[PDB]
Write a protein that binds this ligand. Sequence first.
Ligand SMILES: [K+]
Ligand SMILES: [K+]
Ligand SMILES: [K+]
Ligand SMILES: [K+]
Ligand SMILES: [K+]
Ligand SMILES: [K+]
Ligand SMILES: [Mg+2]
Ligand SMILES: [Mg+2]
Ligand SMILES: [Mg+2]
Ligand SMILES: [Mg+2]
Ligand SMILES: [Mg+2]
Ligand SMILES: [Mg+2]
Ligand SMILES: [Mg+2]
Ligand SMILES: [Mg+2]
Ligand SMILES: [Mg+2]
Ligand SMILES: [Mg+2]
Ligand SMILES: [Zn+2]
Lengths: 141, 71, 140, 184, 140, 124, 100, 55
Amino acid sequence: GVTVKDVNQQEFVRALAAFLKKSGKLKVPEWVDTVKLAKHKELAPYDENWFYTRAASTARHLYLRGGAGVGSMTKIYGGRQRNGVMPSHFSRGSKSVARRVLQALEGLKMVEKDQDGGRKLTPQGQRDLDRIAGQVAAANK
Amino acid sequence: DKLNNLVLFDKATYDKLCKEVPNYKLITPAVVSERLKIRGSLARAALQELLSKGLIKLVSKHRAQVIYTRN
Amino acid sequence: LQSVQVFGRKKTATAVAHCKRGNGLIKVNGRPLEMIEPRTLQYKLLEPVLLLGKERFAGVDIRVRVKGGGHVAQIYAIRQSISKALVAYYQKYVDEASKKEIKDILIQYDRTLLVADPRRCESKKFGGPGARARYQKSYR
Amino acid sequence: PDIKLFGKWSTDDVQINDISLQDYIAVKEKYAKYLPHSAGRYAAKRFRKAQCPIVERLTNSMMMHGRNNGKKLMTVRIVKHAFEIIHLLTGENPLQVLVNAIINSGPREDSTRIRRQAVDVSPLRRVNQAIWLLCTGAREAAFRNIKTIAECLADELINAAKGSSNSYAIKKKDELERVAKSNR
Amino acid sequence: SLVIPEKFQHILRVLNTNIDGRRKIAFAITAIKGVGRRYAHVVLRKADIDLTKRAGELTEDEVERVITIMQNPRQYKIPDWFLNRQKDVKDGKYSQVLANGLDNKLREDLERLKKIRAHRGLRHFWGLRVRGQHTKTTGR
Amino acid sequence: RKFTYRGVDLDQLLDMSYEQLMQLYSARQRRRLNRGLRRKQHSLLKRLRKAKKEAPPMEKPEVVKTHLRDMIILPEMVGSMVGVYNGKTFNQVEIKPEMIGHYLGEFSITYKPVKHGRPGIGAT
Amino acid sequence: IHRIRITLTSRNVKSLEKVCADLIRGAKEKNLKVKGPVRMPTKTLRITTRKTPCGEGSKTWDRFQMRIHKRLIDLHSPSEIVKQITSISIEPGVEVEVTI
Amino acid sequence: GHQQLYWSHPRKFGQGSRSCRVCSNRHGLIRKYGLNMCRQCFRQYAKDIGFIKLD
RNA sequence: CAGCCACCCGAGAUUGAGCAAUAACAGGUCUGUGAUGCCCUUAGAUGUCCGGGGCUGCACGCGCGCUACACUGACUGGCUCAGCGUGUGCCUACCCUACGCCGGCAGGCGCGGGUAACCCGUUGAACCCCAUUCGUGAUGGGGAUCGGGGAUUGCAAUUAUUCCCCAUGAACGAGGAAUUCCCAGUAAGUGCGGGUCAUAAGCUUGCGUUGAUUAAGUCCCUGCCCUU
RNA sequence: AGGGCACCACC
Ligand SMILES: [K+]
Ligand SMILES: [K+]
Ligand SMILES: [K+]
Ligand SMILES: [K+]
Ligand SMILES: [K+]
Ligand SMILES: [K+]
Ligand SMILES: [Mg+2]
Ligand SMILES: [Mg+2]
Ligand SMILES: [Mg+2]
Ligand SMILES: [Mg+2]
Ligand SMILES: [Mg+2]
Ligand SMILES: [Mg+2]
Ligand SMILES: [Mg+2]
Ligand SMILES: [Mg+2]
Ligand SMILES: [Mg+2]
Ligand SMILES: [Mg+2]
Ligand SMILES: [Zn+2]
């Protein structure tokens, strides 16, 4: 038996992103090639398929900690903003990106809206993530 | 004076790489760049190609330092 | 039902290890001990097991819950809590001789494995950026 | 269970040739640790730093200048990679190379400038100044150069252990001792 | 793959600008005034050009396609908010002004502000700061 | 050739209402017009219209003086003569079409440009 | 009967503890199931201000602070009995809020 | 008329809308916890209010 | 003797502050005060309100600072950890915000919780850690200056309030004489609160996080003090 | 002339 917490999280995220891309049923916004992921970024993501990686990361976060909304996701993906000759400060991520990722995951039926607000994993999503974790553990061993 | 490194191998530099480099005790992108007058990106790509072909051996990989050695 | 709950501290980081009769499991926040980040300091976590041997831990399951502080402080809190939990379990459900010998090994290697470091941040004082440094003084 | 630094380098075979520095280079037995990161209170009392493992003292001295202050995880990684490079380049124990470098880099006579007068140098100051010179040489070699800091540190340590004049620490020690001889 | 091709171009001329062929393509077309890193990356994404190749490695057809997309962003779904000349005060059209076009636009804007004797135009004419900065101590 | 603001000639601008002009204006002027002009601005507009009507043919209208330095220059104001207060004096400004969208204050400078004299005692 | 919650708040720890002890002793005498005094975290209101009325001299600061201490007591008793118990002498400076 | 002009400048925010509840001065005002007192008046009345220098 | 040094045991063998004498200074403050003497002014006002401008004005000199000069780095992803504390108000307008939807962003709309160990909030902070691209080039270092556009606060944003987007891409390659602060969870790095606050931090006052080198001395310099 | 003290002194 293998669960997510048993494996390396970076390898798990890569494997889950590959799985989502291979399934190919995840809805991708038309503007993924134009936007940057936050106002504190300077450039758009280097990886062309950054949307699948972000979706996998969001699903893993929902597995670890359910009930997170778009605000929580933007807090999760926030980072340091450099302000030129002024000091740096914390800045949040793109609400549209977080919302589209959550809606796409809901479209895949791996994510459902929680009763108390926010999103959570469906049993199907939990099963998919545990299977991916088992594959990662098998690959490592 | 400013050092003008090569972004892509010429025939002589590529031959010198494939001949001498797999014989060094310490193989790093920085030392290869210094010896062959190539850029760090070209050195990293060349060392990855040599590792794929099996001419050299990987000692350690890290985001800031990658260390290879001869077989 | 044999179990102990023992804490370890480092700055504001606190880790509580629940050590009960078991088969040799060690978890931190539900994750394997080898998966805790940063892995630059993985040997700091592995030190109790490396020093005492896996045979001592083979009879217990230890689950560690850690919170507060930073990454390094949490690492040190986890290792201290694991060591103190094993010592407490031995002194409670085994003889005193085994507890004494494992405690001697741990103390000889590193006292902070069993005794907490009492250092804490010093308060800032007005007239300077921190506890001791003062703002630059000009004359003319 | 033998304890090896980073799980790779053993301390049993390390020899300190200079008997004056044997009490101020903590490298083996009770001073053998898995990592050069102990978070110990070695600065609490005088001479207590003599108990700090020499690898950890090197790691501490690598946290300069200001931009690198407090980045001990980064300096630990730098030291680990430097030891790997040293082992590849020499085939020796990196701990032995470090010990030889420190022994060769410590200045034995200095001048106090009270016109200057020559004075001897205590073993603890010898070790302190050797570490300082080695780290300074590595840092200045790595600044504004494609060569990485780990490679520069490895080269500096190897040259100092050999006693070569390519070493910044060796050159500085020679200059200090020459000035002390002149003011003698 | 790593050997330099025979068709590799050391220097390219695009829009009366010398583009260095040794640089990666995205940071090589930034030599054109009016093209920054963001705009260069979005243009190359629209042009389906691999970002990993150098400027000299591009074929003539690829270079022509890149120039066409660069000079007509709106036809390739490059959004208006990405443009450095949005809702031009004279024409109302959205465009990306490049090189001599950008210089002419700047001169025209300054000339208009000076012609109506607006305060910002007068500040530009006098050579002072125009965005409300203090001039007592800085800008010397 | 002929004047155009956002590609619209002056006559079409005069025809357009406030809601149509808001889309042509920049963000600041659009927000200002959305929040709405007040009694003082309406009084100034009425004064300008009266001056335009009373102006003899082929002659500039009489100068209308005002303190309203934060008045948006609307198309209907083009051709008027406005004495904009600068804190001390009513500087005379003729509204040009290219002034559309700016503030009247931008054409009535509140300070004298600095011509420096010799530094005083000290001032090392 | 009804569940009664008594919230006591004070700036004086000693008087607050005396009142809480007296209330619990009264509840014990009346033979009531009383949950002990739950101690909320102490609130520290701080005002840091320059000492000088003007702007001259070394920049020294006064650190004024006020400490507010809060206690909770739970009872299972009739409202009349709770009011009778709370009718005992209350030390000055203690604010009592009873909720049913 | 004068009724419409007098005191007609809006004072819903800014320094001109606040003053010390003791001396009516508008500078160095403390609004924290709703004190609304200038700093000097606060130092005068801090012990009466209940603020002490433990430190 | 007073006490000093080292060591054992021990959580700890010198935690950090507050308070703080006699006698003084023509030190600062009458621009904190319905504290105040005297003098001045008091209806064409030095009262008071309203409108506009100024306090920010720029050949220059000085002081406190912020950002940097890069690879012990920048960028793009991924992963994973705090503490102090504030929050809907007499006048008084102005609170902290979860979740859902719209927008690329700043933001907008809806709908809830919290007068608070109850809700924001398990305060998913930054540095750091793991991968990526860059490759010694004033360069993907740096981000000044400047053009165009979009929002928000406000009665009002021009002399740009603040914020966002594209573009522009200056000096600066480690700093002369001189000089500041500091010895342990300290210096330094790093972010987060409070005050100011309609709008709001390059300041200050606190908080944690990472975390050292050197020293356990002296009267040489700068001062202060004592005795003859 | 001698003797103390202080990282708002130095080493
Ligand atoms: K380097
Ligand atoms: K006074
Ligand atoms: K007076
Ligand atoms: K007065
Ligand atoms: K004043
Ligand atoms: K005041
Ligand atoms: Mg983040
Ligand atoms: Mg600090
Ligand atoms: Mg460009
Ligand atoms: Mg005086
Ligand atoms: Mg001023
Ligand atoms: Mg940059
Ligand atoms: Mg540049
Ligand atoms: Mg201030
Ligand atoms: Mg001084
Ligand atoms: Mg000095
Ligand atoms: Zn007052």
